[PDB]
Amino acid sequence: IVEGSDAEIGMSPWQVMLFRKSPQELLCGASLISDRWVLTAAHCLLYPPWDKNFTENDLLVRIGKHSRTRYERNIEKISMLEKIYIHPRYNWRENLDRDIALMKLKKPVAFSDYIHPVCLPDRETAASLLQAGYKGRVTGWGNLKETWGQPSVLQVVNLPIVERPVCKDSTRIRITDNMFCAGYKPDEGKRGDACEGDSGGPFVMKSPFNNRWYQMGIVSWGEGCDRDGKYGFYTHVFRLKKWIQKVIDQFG
Amino acid sequence: DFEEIPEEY
Amino acid sequence: LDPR
Amino acid sequence: ADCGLRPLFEKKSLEDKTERELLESYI
| Residue A134 contacts D, CB cutoff 8 Å | yes
Nearest to A69 among B1, B6, B9 (CB): B1
Closest alpha carbon within chain A to C3: A221
Superfamily of domain A13-117+239-251: Trypsin-like serine proteases (2.40.10.10)
> Using CB atoms, which chains have 3+ pairs under 8 A with C?
A
Sorted by where each begins, the domain ranges of chain D are 1-27
Q: Are residues A13 and D18, on separate chains, in Cβ contact within 8 Å?
A: no
Contact A187, A31 (CB under 8 A): no
* A1-12+118-238 and A13-117+239-251 in the same fold: yes
CATH no. for A1-12+118-238: 2.40.10.10
Side-chain-side CA neighbours of residue A68 (13 Å): 24
Q: Is the dihedral of CA A207, A132, A1, A84 positive or negative?
A: positive
Q: What is the Cβ-side half-sphere exposure of residue D17, based on CA atoms within 13 angstroms?
A: 10
Q: Which residues of A142-168 are buried (b: 16+ CB within 10 A; e: fewer)?
A: bbbeeeeeebebbbbbbbbbbeeeebe
What number of other Cβ atoms are within 10 A of residue A63's Cβ? 23
For C1, name the nearest residue in chain A, comparing CA atoms only. A223
Resolution (A): 2.4
- DSSP class of A236: E
Looking at the domain D1-27, which fold is it? Answer: Epsilon-Thrombin; Chain L (4.10.140)
Chain A residues 173-232 with CB within 8 Å of chain D: 205-208, 211-214
Q: Angle at the Cα of A234 (from A231 to A237), degrees rounded to 5?
A: 155
Method: X-ray
